[PDB]
Amino acid sequence: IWFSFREISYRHAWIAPLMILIAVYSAYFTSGNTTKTNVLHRFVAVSYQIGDTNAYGKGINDLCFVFYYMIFFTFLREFLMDVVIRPFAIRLHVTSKHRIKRIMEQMYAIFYTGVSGPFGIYCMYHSDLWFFNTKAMYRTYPDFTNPFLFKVFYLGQAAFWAQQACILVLQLEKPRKDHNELTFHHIVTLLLIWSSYVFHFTKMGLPIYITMDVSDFLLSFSKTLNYLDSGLAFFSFAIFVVAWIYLRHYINLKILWSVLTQFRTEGNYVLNFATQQYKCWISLPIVFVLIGALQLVNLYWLFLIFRVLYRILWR
Amino acid sequence: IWFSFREISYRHAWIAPLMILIAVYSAYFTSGNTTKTNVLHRFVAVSYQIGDTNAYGKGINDLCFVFYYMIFFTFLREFLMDVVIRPFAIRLHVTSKHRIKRIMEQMYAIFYTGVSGPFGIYCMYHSDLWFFNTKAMYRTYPDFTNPFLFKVFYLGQAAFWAQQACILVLQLEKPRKDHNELTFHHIVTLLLIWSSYVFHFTKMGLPIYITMDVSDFLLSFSKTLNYLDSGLAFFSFAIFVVAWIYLRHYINLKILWSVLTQFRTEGNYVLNFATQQYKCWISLPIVFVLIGALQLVNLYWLFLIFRVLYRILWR
Amino acid sequence: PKIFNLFRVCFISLLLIAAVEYFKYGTRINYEWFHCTPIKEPQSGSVIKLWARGGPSCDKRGEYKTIVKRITRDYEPNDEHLSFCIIENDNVPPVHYPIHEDKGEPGYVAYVGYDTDSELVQELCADSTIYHM
Amino acid sequence: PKIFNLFRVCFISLLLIAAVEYFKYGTRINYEWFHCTPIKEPQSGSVIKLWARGGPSCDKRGEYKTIVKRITRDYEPNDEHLSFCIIENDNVPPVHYPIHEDKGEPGYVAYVGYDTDSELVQELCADSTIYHM
Numbered sequence: 001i002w003f004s005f006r007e008i009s010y011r012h013a014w015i016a017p018l019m020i021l022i023a024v025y026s027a028y029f030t031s032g033n034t035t036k037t038n039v040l041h042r043f044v045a046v047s048y049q050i051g052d053t054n055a056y057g058k059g060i061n062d063l064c065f066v067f068y069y070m071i072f073f074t075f076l077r078e079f080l081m082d083v084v085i086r087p088f089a090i091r092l093h094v095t096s097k098h099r100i101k102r103i104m105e106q107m108y109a110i111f112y113t114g115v116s117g118p119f120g121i122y123c124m125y126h127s128d129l130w131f132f133n134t135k136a137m138y139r140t141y142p143d144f145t146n147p148f149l150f151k152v153f154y155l156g157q158a159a160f161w162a163q164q165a166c167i168l169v170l171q172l173e174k175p176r177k178d179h180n181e182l183t184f185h186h187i188v189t190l191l192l193i194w195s196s197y198v199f200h201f202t203k204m205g206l207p208i209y210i211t212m213d214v215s216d217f218l219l220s221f222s223k224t225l226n227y228l229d230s231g232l233a234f235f236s237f238a239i240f241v242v243a244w245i246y247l248r249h250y251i252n253l254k255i256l257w258s259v260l261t262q263f264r265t266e267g268n269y270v271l272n273f274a275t276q277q278y279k280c281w282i283s284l285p286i287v288f289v290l291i292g293a294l295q296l297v298n299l300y301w302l303f304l305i306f307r308v309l310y311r312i313l314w315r
Numbered sequence: 316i317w318f319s320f321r322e323i324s325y326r327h328a329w330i331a332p333l334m335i336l337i338a339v340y341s342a343y344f345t346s347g348n349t350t351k352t353n354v355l356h357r358f359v360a361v362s363y364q365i366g367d368t369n370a371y372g373k374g375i376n377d378l379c380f381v382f383y384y385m386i387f388f389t390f391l392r393e394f395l396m397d398v399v400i401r402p403f404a405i406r407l408h409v410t411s412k413h414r415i416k417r418i419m420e421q422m423y424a425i426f427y428t429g430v431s432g433p434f435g436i437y438c439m440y441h442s443d444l445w446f447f448n449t450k451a452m453y454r455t456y457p458d459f460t461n462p463f464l465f466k467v468f469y470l471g472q473a474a475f476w477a478q479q480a481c482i483l484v485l486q487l488e489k490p491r492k493d494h495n496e497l498t499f500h501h502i503v504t505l506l507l508i509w510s511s512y513v514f515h516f517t518k519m520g521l522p523i524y525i526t527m528d529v530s531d532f533l534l535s536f537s538k539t540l541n542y543l544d545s546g547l548a549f550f551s552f553a554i555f556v557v558a559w560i561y562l563r564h565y566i567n568l569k570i571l572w573s574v575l576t577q578f579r580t581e582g583n584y585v586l587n588f589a590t591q592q593y594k595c596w597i598s599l600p601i602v603f604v605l606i607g608a609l610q611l612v613n614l615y616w617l618f619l620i621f622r623v624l625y626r627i628l629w630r
Numbered sequence: 631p632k633i634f635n636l637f638r639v640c641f642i643s644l645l646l647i648a649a650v651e652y653f654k655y656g657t658r659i660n661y662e663w664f665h666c667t668p669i670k671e672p673q674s675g676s677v678i679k680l681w682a683r684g685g686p687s688c689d690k691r692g693e694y695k696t697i698v699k700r701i702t703r704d705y706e707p708n709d710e711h712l713s714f715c716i717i718e719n720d721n722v723p724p725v726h727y728p729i730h731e732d733k734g735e736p737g738y739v740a741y742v743g744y745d746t747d748s749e750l751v752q753e754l755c756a757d758s759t760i761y762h763m
Numbered sequence: 764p765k766i767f768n769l770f771r772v773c774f775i776s777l778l779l780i781a782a783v784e785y786f787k788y789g790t791r792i793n794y795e796w797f798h799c800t801p802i803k804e805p806q807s808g809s810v811i812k813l814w815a816r817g818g819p820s821c822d823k824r825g826e827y828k829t830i831v832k833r834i835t836r837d838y839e840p841n842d843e844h845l846s847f848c849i850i851e852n853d854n855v856p857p858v859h860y861p862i863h864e865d866k867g868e869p870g871y872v873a874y875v876g877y878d879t880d881s882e883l884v885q886e887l888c889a890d891s892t893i894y895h896m
């Protein structure tokens with residue numbers, strides 16, 4: 001039956017990750033201690049809850065969590081992609097190869113991105129950061145402790161983008177298309193997530209993808225309605241372009257400016273290795289450079305957006 | 316004239332190393348301070364003379380000395396090889412290719428080996444090690460300080476064998492012949508010299524090449540008289556075989572046994588990282604393993620010697 | 631003339647040379663991690679008693695080094711300020727430990743605690759000077 | 764499916780993760796090499812005076828750590844036995860240094876010397892306990 005199981009794993013792509021994670025979950029949820037005294041708990045949940053409150057520390061169990069949810073997010077992508085997005089590519093009349101491949105990719109982008117957008121907005125809502133407050137970013141800097149939703153948001157993003165980057169370097173098929181911009185995006189996103197979490201620049205991390213996720217939701221919606229020829233596509237693309245101009249430019253420029261000005265002015269700005277607070281004049285370069293890298297990528301992308309916009313406007 | 320200089324450096328092989336070392340020596344010996352306050356002095360002489368006595372410390376100037384004398388020993392080999400050993404290969408009737416190549420190699424071996432044999436014996440003579448005294452090896456172990464002749468003997472051996480090993484890995488010509496035994500010999504010799512000097516097992520190091528050098532002198536003399544057909548070759552080979560059996564087996568077996576017994580019994584045997592004395596039960600394995608490696612190589616070599624001996628005896 | 635093979639071999643040889651020299655230097659400067667093992671003796675609320683025991687290479691400064699590093703990186707003063715006292719055994723030669731396990735009185739004992747209970751450190755440290763931190 | 768390219772990329776990513784975590788840990792445990800710079804004040808034959816000066820991250824234990832490491836690895840007791848005294852400035856709060864260069868009195872001063880001149884250490888260290896080594 002091993003050969004038949006391999007055959008079904010060749011006709012699908014989610015059977016093996018599904019088995020791995022269902023085995024882990026079933027073994028963990030077999031009665032016992034569903035608490036911090038279990039290896040499967042370090043692999044299934046965020047650990048290091050300080051005392052009995054809404055504060056969470058860091059550790060190696062964080063890496064265990066991240067890798068287990070890479071394993072999980074492979075299963076989410078394969079299952080959704082095939083089982084759902086091929087029926088939505090066939091039950092609606094679409095006739096091409098690149099058209100159907102990219103229509104699957106864009107609707108999966110719509111799915112995960114519209115899941116991660118509102119969750120980021122909610123996480124920023126019940127916090128002192130509400131509507132991108134640039135002073136709560138630096139008020140209480142060292143932030144060794146993160147809330148439950150906020151920590152799980154950070155580690156889910158890490159698992160998702162790490163899985164993207166590893167299937168980017170394990171070339172199964174589809175050799176080369178956009179992979180220069182794509183690899184720059186994946187490497188920069190993964191480095192920013194890791195370095196933002198490790199070095200406690202964490203409340204700084206929430207507002208920046210909030211923008212990336214909701215803007216990507218709008219962009220992928222516009223491209224999906226392009227594929228599925230509807231005539232409402234240009235309306236969605238205009239909404240997308242105004243939302244892109246607002247979020248990815250105005251909010252990130254405000255955040256950069258926030259770095260430059262209120263990184264010094266607000267909170268603690270005397271380096272102290274004992275206290276483990278790195279917010280000083282040595283890390284301001286690094287933070288500004290990472291934000292600048294993201295902004296350069298988004299600048300090239302709106303050059304592309306507006307090039308397409310005017311060509312279609314007079315075409 | 317640069318092209319003509321390259322042409323003369325192609326018709327010879329010692330012009331460039333000769334220029335390098337003659338420039339270094341001339342610059343150093345231009346009037347001034349021929350003392351420890353000069354970089355060329357760290358490149359021309361043994362440094363770290365403790366006080367004003369016959370004791371010498373260690374340092375990086377040791378590596379500078381070793382590499383400069385690798386540069387020098389390239390010049391000694393090329394100059395002697397060509398300028399002397401080709402006339403002694405032609406002015407005496409010899410008619411072959413392998414015959415003349417190996418006759419040059421064996422007579423150069425005779426030269427450097429009969430230079431390094433008596434110097435090692437002299438160094439062991441005016442010391443408390445006289446005729447392989449296995450207790451002066453361990454009496455005063457930590458030996459941070461070595462005499463002048465003894466230190467220069469150790470660093471000349473290091474430079475010579477390092478130059479051999481680097482022209483072994485920079486294949487100019489003569490691709491492959493005996494290079495398995497040769498590379499094992501070169502790597503083991505260089506590791507033993509370096510680890511013997513660095514870890515203060517230095518008076519342990521003198522007796523072991525003394526044996527290698529004088530035995531190699533006898534062996535190369537026998538092979539040279541083989542080449543230059545004389546009829547006295549078998550007498551020299553019998554003298555060689557008895558000297559090999561005495562030195563490389565009896566003396567090294569005595570030295571190994573010395574390790575095993577008097578490494579503990581004699582001197583200091585309590586590990587102390589502060590005092591920087593490594594003579595303990597943790598280094599006895601390492602020392603015995605290196606001596607055993609040398610002895611295994613010499614065991615294979617007398618198997619070869621006796622195989623040749625009996626075949627020639629009944630041939 | 632395959633130069634690069636040479637270059638990599640020589641560059642890794644120099645790397646072993648540097649690695650072993652760092653081995654020697656590091657094991658010399660902070661040898662007390664090798665020879666001395668620090669003993670923690672629990673006490674009342676927040677104080678403990680320090681000392682070390684090793685072979686003859688755990689001399690008095692090995693004990694002082696290991697005691698002060700235990701004191702200084704087992705207690706975070708930014709959270710709460712601590713207070714300690716170090717008392718020396720004045721009749722035991724500096725190098726005083728036997729190879730075997732009947733070693734006896736250490737060279738140094740130190741009492742260290744937080745400032746919730748500083749009178750407890752006053753009690754345990756009889757009349758020796760008391761260092762604040 | 765070029766697995767090995769993945770494997771090397773992930774193995775170097777984990778290597779950066781471990782390297783940066785060691786960076787954080789190391790710079791935390793022995794931060795006094797970053798914030799505190801030890802001042803040696805020469806004296807008569809073999810004694811010196813120790814202290815440290817840095818920013819507000821050079822607290823009292825930064826000074827104690829750097830002073831004791833200077834004392835313990837600037838003096839070899841196997842050659843000759845030393846003797847030192849540490850005196851604390853009892854009216855200066857633990858965290859007491861200004862960012863600027865008008866810093867003032869340190870938290871700790873220590874006198875250390877060899878046993879050729881131990882009465883000199885007796886003189887410089889007034890009535891504080893005197894540690895042998």
Ligand SMILES: CCCC[C@@H](C)[C@@H](OC(=O)C[C@@H](CC(=O)O)C(=O)O)[C@H](C[C@@H](C)C[C@H](O)CCCC[C@@H](O)C[C@H](O)[C@H](C)N)OC(=O)C[C@@H](CC(=O)O)C(=O)O
Pocket residue numbers: 102109178185216219222223225226233234235237301304305308312
């Ligand atoms: C009325 C609605 C019609 C849609 C219309 C505007 C469409 O432009 C055209 O109308 C089609 C013709 C125009 C023409 O000539 O007529 C052309 O644009 O190609 C649009 C333009 C595009 C250049 C914008 C960038 O793409 C987006 C990539 C940004 C970063 C994102 O990825 C984030 C990140 O990575 C991660 C997910 N968070 O989208 C495409 O065109 C894409 C191409 C794909 C391709 O070719 O690569 C395609 O359409 O599928």
Ligand SMILES: CCCC[C@@H](C)[C@@H](OC(=O)C[C@@H](CC(=O)O)C(=O)O)[C@H](C[C@@H](C)C[C@H](O)CCCC[C@@H](O)C[C@H](O)[C@H](C)N)OC(=O)C[C@@H](CC(=O)O)C(=O)O
Pocket residue numbers: 417424493500531534537538540541548549550552616619620623627
């Ligand atoms: C009456 C005098 C005639 C000389 C005669 C005994 C000669 O044996 C023959 O009479 C010739 C026929 C015998 C036959 O069949 O009639 C055969 O021995 O080959 C002899 C035997 C040889 C097998 C011994 C090892 O070699 C030495 C290498 C040991 C380690 C040394 O290197 C140290 C280290 O590296 C470094 C330098 N410190 O020497 C050779 O033969 C060598 C070969 C070379 C070759 O072939 O590799 C040759 O002669 O030039």
